[PDB]
Design a protein around this ligand. Structure first.
Ligand code: SF4
Ligand code: SF4
Ligand code: SF4
Lengths: 146, 356, 155, 75, 110, 167, 160, 77
């Protein structure tokens, strides 16, 4: 049993925001990510289990704030953004898009998930690859609830 | 005389250690124990941290029984400041310390019986960690020892599970006692080693099972009147058979003695959570105070020279098993590579309090 | 103390510092007479030595390697504790080890040399028991700086 | 009640701290010789520690160290 | 034993008879293996600069008994030199390995 | 500031070759089988969840790693060099743990020693946390298509003798 | 009769192997419990729940910590005693979850939860924000793969 | 020089497709529904059965349809 149906690729090039409803039954999730990577794209990772203010983290150069262990000062520096530097992390020209692989469907407000589906359409080189709250099968419904 | 490397990944799992031996043939004759592998520099950082900040640090020493470390490092400031602990919280501390002694001896004999299996003891250990979850909430990383006693109170389910633990646990213990009488491979594969007597175990440095192995009723908390030990039932192992099976009967008798102490303390209940808490922050004094408690490996110790500040000026620990490690250079002289597994099992040591 | 005015009063320097917090007693003893003093306190009833304590008060000055010798045994339980206070300095780390008579002092004196650098004699293998053998400097003494090592920072 | 304040730069010479182990690594080198250590506590003696290096601190005599300036250095 | 080295990321002492990559047996020939994990770019001219800097550091820092503590010190300040070289942009990262953890922190907008 | 890859094409673009790559990758993501590597506070998860130190490429570092532990650790990674990586499962394999400030003989993470895929919360979590960690590693290896078997050796060396002074 | 004594030793050995085989055959009957993947009480001390507006002043999280990890920048606003708190940055790689300021907070906005699934792919991702620390983790009764965990009872034998 | 059978087709191929098709879903179903309701005698004979009955389970190994609904839930995905 192995879908081998690139309909998920058609969904990611048509809707570009699909909840990957797939269990913890091993690695049956990255095969469509591997097919997106074999198409010439570049895929990087994120997780919403500790990502707060997602539009303020993907853009607007959210602060670094290095954790001093009671020795160094605050040093409130500005780290580069998540996906703007990732668009800056495409050195050749053959890379057609940038896939943002998100792997945490829990602890993610539906409001903020809809806000993150916004920068999947804010540019045209952003693919949202969020999770789908771990169904038993492999389902890819679109961002409809968010 | 082919030099063994005695690498970091041992065929057994009892820590990382170095025991290079010439081993003329298969007889090992000369031991050079190299240590320093699991080292963290507890003394200098403890001089650089307070009591409420080195109080999360007391988990990396004897983590098979974490109640003893935080127990002695909180009993330090209690007798230092001369602040009285009420009888209820102190007796519940006695119960959980003896339960951690139970856990230390069973988590010794688990991997020791695995080397010479895991779910033969884990069917007890799941309820043991359920008792740790109902007692403090963590598995072995508890932070629940204050000056006035336990940081929290016992819930209404933990006392019922503590009442059920005796007839949940002692029956499988006595079903596990008859194996060494039945199975002769423990009468032929670990029999013999441990040839030190009492006048020599007093002579070198020894304490705990290696001192009780010779038939000496030794106990710190019986000599030093501590936590009303003469009220409870006691039977310190005066087993004088010397060898490793004598040490196994020592550990069975220590577990059964702790079972008798907890079983007499099931319905004791002589008293709040923390006595003397006006303020969250305090300091320490400057005395010459060396506090010790009956370790499961024998006289864990805390040395303290105060600063009258927020930091202790001197914080030195005397771990039981590291002083116990000194005897293997003398218990290596006429044994085999198939014997040193039994040796490093019968020392009953983990490398958390060794390097530290 | 008891033995300072009964046994060590016959021509030994049992320079007392008063009583300790609970029952112990601190008596200053010079390294010059420390092995014979150890044998004299050994043939007294005291047999059980544990927790050699190397405290580092006055950094750059006095250095001490005190004991906690007592007289516990098998049947009797007369626990008379005492601190044999031996002293040294930074300029003179020379101290005699008890490893010739009390041969279980391998790990204790090796940790004392490993964390302070107290020079020893009559010892079978004095090596750095926690640090590498190439390691210079001693961390427990309070006038020490851990040098520019990248494994000590997170970065 | 003490010698100096808390938070001044500590400059160290190899001859000025000759009681310590500053002459073993002849040459590697070190880093606390310049104005890097900061005074964190004082007693005759004063606690020291670098403003950016997170390592353990130390205790050194009030004349063996030297209050240099108020110039922290990081990045 | 026989291995006498302080081997970390991008700095490996490896004082052995290693003219190519085949290891051996052990001598005074310290073979500085750099970047085992493919973490940064490491252009050949910049690698020659870092190797010449390490040669000057081991030339000026010797004279004392060459033991493991000198190896710790020389690998440590070699890693400081690599960190201050990549912070000034002489050494970019890689993004061709399967981790790319950005081990020296992200370059800011300053 | 990064480097640039090659990224020419995918030569093995048949159905049989990508099918074999997917099946071998999913079976590679199925068969963890670690070397255990306990001997610390993270050994306690082994009883709830070989001996040849060149066999098991999918080892997770479940132990407190120190500076003296580091040469044997990088030698053991030299004994697992090409195929697979390690998983940090103790805050001391990540940041140095609770002694991240003032410990001299403890490395601040093996993230300056060895390539690490997954970072744990650290101190012994529940026994299903390692199951979720190896499941997320299986999802990571499932993303990997064995890099299309694309290979480079540096070989930096000086043949000038050092100014040595042995014992 | 030394080989007879070898035979008697093996007779006692076979009796012990048979008895221990009965013991282990009975030990293989541990069917109801079987802890595994899903496919506790309130003091789990896992993921720490944080509230931003209840967080006000006295910075004790940075003081009682064994490593002093918290980094909160603050600039005093005049005549209203407001510190203008920003960027509650907690690194869980630095964090031990040893729990001092969870119970030592004067505000007591620091509370623990039952979440422990923070195994991440990068160490710079672990620097979490104040809105990421205000998430309700999971209602573990409400999963289609998680049953009732045997908290109060033990050896229930009810799934089968 | 015997040729005692003289059957050309549909003698062992019928029995092979019978044992490879009818057996493995009922075998895997008995492995599912009797995973806990068993004596160690019953687990012993089930282990012997699954050892005897291995290579028919190759078409049923990746497919898994009726095995996760321990409630009365709704497909809220
Ligand atoms: S982070 Fe703590 S519990 Fe985990 S391995 Fe390191 S010392 Fe042990
Ligand atoms: S949360 Fe605690 S430490 Fe932080 S400002 Fe409030 S009282 Fe102070
Ligand atoms: S959670 Fe634990 S380690 Fe973290 S700041 Fe609070 S007390 Fe310190």
């Amino acid at each position: 049993v192995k879908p081998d149906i690139g309909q998920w690729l058609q969904d990611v090039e048509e809707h570009k925001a699909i909840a990957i409803y797939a269990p913890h039954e091993g690695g049956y999730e990255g095969r469509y990510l591997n097919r997106l990577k074999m198409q010439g794209y570049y895929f990087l990772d994120i997780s919403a289990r500790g990502l707060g203010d997602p539009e303020t983290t993907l853009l607007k150069n959210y602060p670094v704030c290095p954790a001093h262990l009671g020795k160094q000062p605050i040093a409130r520096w500005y780290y580069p953004p998540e996906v703007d530097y990732r668009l800056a992390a495409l050195p050749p020209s053959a890379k057609g898009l940038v896939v943002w692989v998100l792997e945490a469907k829990v602890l993610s407000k539906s409001e903020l998930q809809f806000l993150a589906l916004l920068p999947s359409l804010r540019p045209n080189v952003r693919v949202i690859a969020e999770c789908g709250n771990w169904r038993k099968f492999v389902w890819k419904p679109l961002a409809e609830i968010a | 005389l082919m030099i063994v490397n005695m690498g970091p990944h041992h065929p057994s799992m009892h820590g990382v250690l170095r025991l290079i031996v010439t081993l003329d043939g298969e007889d090992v004759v000369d031991c050079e124990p190299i240590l320093g592998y699991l080292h963290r520099g507890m003394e200098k950082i403890a001089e650089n941290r307070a009591i409420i900040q080195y109080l999360p640090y007391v988990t990396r020493w004897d983590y098979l029984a974490t109640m003893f470390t935080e127990a002695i490092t909180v009993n330090g400031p209690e007798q230092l400041g001369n602040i009285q602990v009420p009888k209820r919280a102190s007796y519940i501390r006695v119960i959980m310390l003896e339960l951690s002694r139970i856990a230390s001896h069973l988590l010794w004999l688990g991997p020791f019986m695995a080397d010479i299996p895991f779910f033969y003891i884990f069917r007890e250990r799941e309820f043991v960690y359920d008792l740790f979850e109902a007692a403090t909430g963590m598995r072995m990383m508890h932070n629940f020892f204050r000056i006035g006693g336990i940081a929290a109170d016992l819930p209404y389910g933990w006392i019922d599970k503590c009442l059920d633990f005796c007839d949940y646990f002692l029956t499988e213990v006595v079903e596990y006692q008859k194996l060494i009488t039945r199975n002769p491979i423990f009468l032929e594969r670990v029999e013999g080693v441990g040839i030190i007597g009492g006048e020599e175990a007093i002579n070198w440095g020894l304490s705990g099972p290696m001192l009780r192995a010779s038939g000496i009723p030794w106990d710190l908390r019986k000599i030093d009147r501590y936590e009303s030990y003469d009220e409870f039932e006691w039977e310190i192992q005066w087993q004088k058979q010397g060898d490793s099976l004598a040490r196994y009967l020592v550990r069975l008798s220590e577990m059964t003695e702790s079972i008798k102490i907890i079983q007499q303390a099931l319905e004791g209940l002589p008293y709040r959570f923390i006595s003397k808490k006006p303020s969250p922050t305090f300091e320490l004094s400057k005395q010459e105070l060396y506090v010790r408690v009956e370790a499961p490996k024998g006289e864990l110790g805390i040395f303290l020279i105060g600063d009258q500040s927020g930091f202790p000026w001197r914080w030195k620990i005397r771990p039981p098993g590291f002083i116990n490690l000194q005897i293997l250079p003398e218990l290596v002289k006429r044994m085999k590579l198939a014997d040193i597994m039994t040796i490093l099992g019968s020392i009953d040591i983990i490398m958390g309090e060794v390097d530290r | 103390g008891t033995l300072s005015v009964w046994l060590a009063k016959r021509g030994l320097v049992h320079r007392s510092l008063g009583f300790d917090y609970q029952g112990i007693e601190t008596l200053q003893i010079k390294p010059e007479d420390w092995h014979s003093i150890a044998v004299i306190l050994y043939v007294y009833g005291y047999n059980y030595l544990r927790s050699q304590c190397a405290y580092d008060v006055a950094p750059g000055g006095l250095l001490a390697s005190v004991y906690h010798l007592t007289r516990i045994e098998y049947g009797v339980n007369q626990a008379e504790e005492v601190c044999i206070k031996v002293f040294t300095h930074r300029s003179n780390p020379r101290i005699p080890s008890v490893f010739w008579v009390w041969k279980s002092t391998d790990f204790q004196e090796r940790e004392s040399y490993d964390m302070l650098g107290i020079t020893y004699d009559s010892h079978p293998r004095l090596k750095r028991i926690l640090m590498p053998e190439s390691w210079i400097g001693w961390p427990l003494r309070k006038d020490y700086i851990a040098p520019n090592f990248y494994e000590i920072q997170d970065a | 009640v003490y010698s100096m304040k808390k938070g001044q730069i500590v400059r160290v010479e190899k001859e000025k701290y000759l009681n310590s182990i500053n002459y073993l690594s002849v040459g590697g080198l070190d880093y606390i010789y310049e104005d890097r250590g900061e005074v964190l506590d004082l007693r005759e003696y004063a606690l020291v520690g670098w403003v950016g290096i997170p390592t353990a601190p130390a205790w050194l005599p009030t004349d063996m160290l030297i209050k240099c300036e108020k110039l922290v250095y990081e990045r | 034993g026989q291995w006498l080295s302080s081997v970390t990321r991008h700095v490996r002492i490896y004082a052995a008879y290693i003219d190519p990559e085949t290891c051996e047996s052990q001598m005074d020939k310290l073979t500085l293996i750099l970047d085992p994990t493919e973490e940064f770019v490491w252009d050949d001219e910049s690698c020659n600069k870092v190797y010449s800097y390490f040669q000057e550091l081991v030339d000026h820092y010797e004279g004392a008994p060459l033991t493991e503590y000198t190896l710790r010190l020389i690998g440590s300040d070699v890693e400081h030199y690599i960190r201050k070289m990549l912070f000034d942009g002489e050494i970019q990262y890689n993004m061709d390995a399967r981790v790319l953890n950005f081990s020296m922190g992200k370059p800011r907008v300053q | 500031s990064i480097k640039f890859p090659i990224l020419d094409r995918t030569t093995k673009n048949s159905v049989i070759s990508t099918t074999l790559n997917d099946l071998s990758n999913w079976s590679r993501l199925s068969s963890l089988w670690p070397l255990l590597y306990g001997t610390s506070c993270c050994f306690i998860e082994f009883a709830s969840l070989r001996s040849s130190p060149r066999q098991a490429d999918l080892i997770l570092t479940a132990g407190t790693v120190t500076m003296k532990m580091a040469p044997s650790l990088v030698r053991l990674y030299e004994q697992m060099p090409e195929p697979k990586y390690v998983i940090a499962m103790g805050a001391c394999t990540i940041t140095g743990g609770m002694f991240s400030t003032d410990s001299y003989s403890t490395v601040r993470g093996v993230d300056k020693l060895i390539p690490v895929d997954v970072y744990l919360p650290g101190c012994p979590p529940k026994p299903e946390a390692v199951i979720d960690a190896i499941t997320k590693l299986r999802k990571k290896i499932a993303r990997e298509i064995y890099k299309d078997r694309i290979r480079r050796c540096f070989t930096t060396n000086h043949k000038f003798f050092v100014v040595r002074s042995p014992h | 009769t030394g080989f007879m004594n070898y035979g008697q030793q093996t007779l006692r050995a076979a009796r012990y192997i048979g008895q221990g085989f009965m013991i282990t055959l009975s030990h293989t009957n541990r069917l109801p419990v079987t802890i595994q993947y899903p496919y506790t009480s309130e003091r789990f001390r896992g993921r720490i729940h944080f509230e931003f507006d209840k967080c006000i002043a006295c910075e004790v999280c940075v003081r009682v910590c064994p490593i002093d990890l918290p980094v909160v920048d603050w600039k005093l606003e005049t005549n209203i005693r407001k510190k203008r708190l920003l960027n509650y940055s907690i690194d869980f790689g630095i964090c031990i979850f040893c729990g001092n300021c969870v119970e030592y907070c004067p505000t007591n906005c620091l509370s623990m939860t039952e979440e422990y699934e923070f195994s991440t792919y990068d160490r710079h991702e672990l620097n979490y924000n104040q809105i990421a620390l205000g998430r309700l983790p999971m209602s573990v009764i409400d999963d289609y793969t998680i049953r009732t965990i045997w908290n109060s009872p033990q050896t229930k034998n009810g799934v089968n | 020089n015997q040729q005692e059978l003289s059957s050309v087709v549909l003698d062992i191929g019928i029995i092979s497709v019978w044992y490879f098709l009818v057996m493995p879903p009922i075998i895997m179903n008995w492995l599912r529904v009797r995973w806990y309701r068993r004596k160690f005698f019953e687990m012993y004979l089930q282990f012997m059965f699954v050892f005897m009955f291995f290579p028919g389970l190759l078409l049923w190994a990746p497919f898994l349809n009726f095995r996760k609904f321990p409630r009365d839930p709704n497909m809220k995905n």
